[PDB]
Design a binder for this molecule. Structure first.
Ligand SMILES: C[C@]12CC[C@@H]3c4ccc(O)cc4CC[C@H]3[C@@H]1CC[C@@H]2O
Ligand SMILES: C[C@]12CC[C@@H]3c4ccc(O)cc4CC[C@H]3[C@@H]1CC[C@@H]2O
Lengths: 282, 282
């Protein structure tokens, strides 16, 4: 179809749902290049596509490893239409655990995939959009890019990094007609490490707090996780907005914590509120 | 002396000033390990130390490359007191230019030094502080970690990343008696790329906007840059606070732009205001 969409990280989760949502759109106006790091994981995407009866040719899979600029360049060459109307930077990795228990390689990988990988995509696709004077870039954000969460230090670092990157670009892009938007997701229905391993790399008190955090997050997920269909639709709302805003929120549930965070720049109200919220009183 | 301070990136700028400010303190209560990536750049630090008459033994230089965990481990071993009371994570790199004109290596380096290097330091020193139930960690922040600036995409990405990292850690650290604070700096009196090189890697319109930005920043610096002595003193105010806050601001000048940014979560007021502020009307 006519609007060419390229999405990264479509093997599961939001990327998978978004790819099939667009490819199966009743208007048949989207051509979707769903990219994955490893093609051997494409089965779920095709099963979903078949379930939604995506018309033949509305969806194509490409292997694209955001850690490698050559892979990024090669996938761009595979876009037969010679243009990308909507670029969805969704590829992302999580990392949970006490900071001192995280391997340096794992820390570097999260940043390389989440942040540098997004930079690689923008460097490869943005020039063309600037030239044409049109294009939409949607970036999967997280409420973790808006406020710090204990035991998610590196993940939050990476999501905050995207906020800074995108906001900086948005200020420049205004006159180019290229729109960039972050879709700020809360928990969505869709890694960890052996207790033994974690305990071996941290102290007993940190380990105890980790347990409390895990218990707390499990509850937040139960109460607040959204269906992927609801979240994917927010991407569509952003891509159809004639004048998209910088951020779209999939839920308003965290806006108050965000405001408290915003109203006390010293950060002490937020730190204290979040600490009592997750652990209790200290 | 008694309070052991370890500071990264002391070859120039804030780190250099802070190191000599602490080592020369009239109380003679600080022992400072000033670290540098390359010892051949230590001359300015020693000239400054001599000018301030730092008592012999109040300052020692160590080579510490934050990109290398072995180097981090080796510097930690050189701390003869066997403890670090105050850790100042200051090492930082800047990167200015149109995103598409930045080399992938330069982008990765900024993140590795600014973000992963800080993680390496925390992983190496935080466990000890948690064990003792005391310690202060000061991290050099920037107003660029609080709001996006055009042409500073990667730099802002890295400073925003520190905000997320530190805020996440602060929530956990509250009960450990380990204090973490970001010192949010505006311009301070203390890299770029050939016009030809930049033009070769971007379009003429982006290049034009880059010129406008450079003109604008030159003016902001002239009007708002603070003396390094004033900025270094903010670190001291934070390190002496009995109950330090998460953030200290060296200036209040940008607080309004920060508030506008905070009051419109969609980001459109900020993007528009910043765009007119730097370029004009579009
Ligand atoms: C950061 C996430 C959204 C915010 C969630 C949250 C939000 C608030 C809170 O008090 C705890 C948690 C735990 C899990 C978090 C989620 C894990 C993945 C998701 O992106
Ligand atoms: C980001 C910095 C502080 C904020 C400064 C600013 C702040 C506001 C603004 O409109 C423009 C600039 C240009 C230079 C920026 C500085 C460059 C180094 C410093 O950390």
């Amino acid at each position: 179809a006519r609007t060419v969409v390229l999405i990264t990280g479509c093997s599961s989760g939001i990327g998978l749902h978004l790819a099939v949502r667009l490819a199966s759109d009743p208007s048949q106006s989207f051509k979707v290049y769903a990219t994955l790091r490893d093609l051997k994981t494409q089965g779920r995407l095709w099963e979903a596509a078949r379930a939604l009866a995506c018309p033949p040719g509305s969806l194509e899979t490409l292997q694209l490893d955001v850690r490698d600029s050559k892979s990024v360049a090669a996938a761009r060459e595979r876009v037969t239409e010679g243009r990308v109307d909507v670029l969805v930077c969704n590829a992302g990795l999580g990392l949970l655990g006490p900071l001192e228990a995280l391997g340096e390689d794992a820390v570097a990988s999260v940043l390389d995939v989440n942040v540098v990988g997004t930079v690689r995509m923008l460097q490869a696709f943005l020039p063309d959009m600037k030239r044409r004077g049109s294009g939409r870039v949607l970036v999967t954000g997280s409420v973790g890019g808006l406020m710090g969460l204990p035991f998610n230090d590196v993940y939050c670092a990476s999501k905050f990094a995207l906020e800074g990157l995108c906001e900086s670009l948005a200020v420049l892009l205004l006159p180019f007609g290229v729109h960039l938007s972050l879709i700020e997701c809360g928990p969505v229905h869709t890694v960890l490490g052996s207790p033994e391993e974690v305990l071996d790399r941290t102290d007993i008190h940190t380990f105890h707090r980790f347990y409390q955090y895990l218990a707390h997050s499990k509850q937040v997920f139960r109460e607040a996780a959204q269906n992927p269909e609801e979240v994917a639709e927010v991407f569509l709302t952003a891509l159809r907005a004639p004048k998209p805003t910088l951020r779209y929120f999939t839920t308003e549930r965290f806006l108050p914590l965000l405001r408290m965070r915003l109203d006390d720049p010293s950060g002490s109200n937020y730190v204290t509120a979040m600490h009592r919220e997750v652990f209790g009183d200290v």
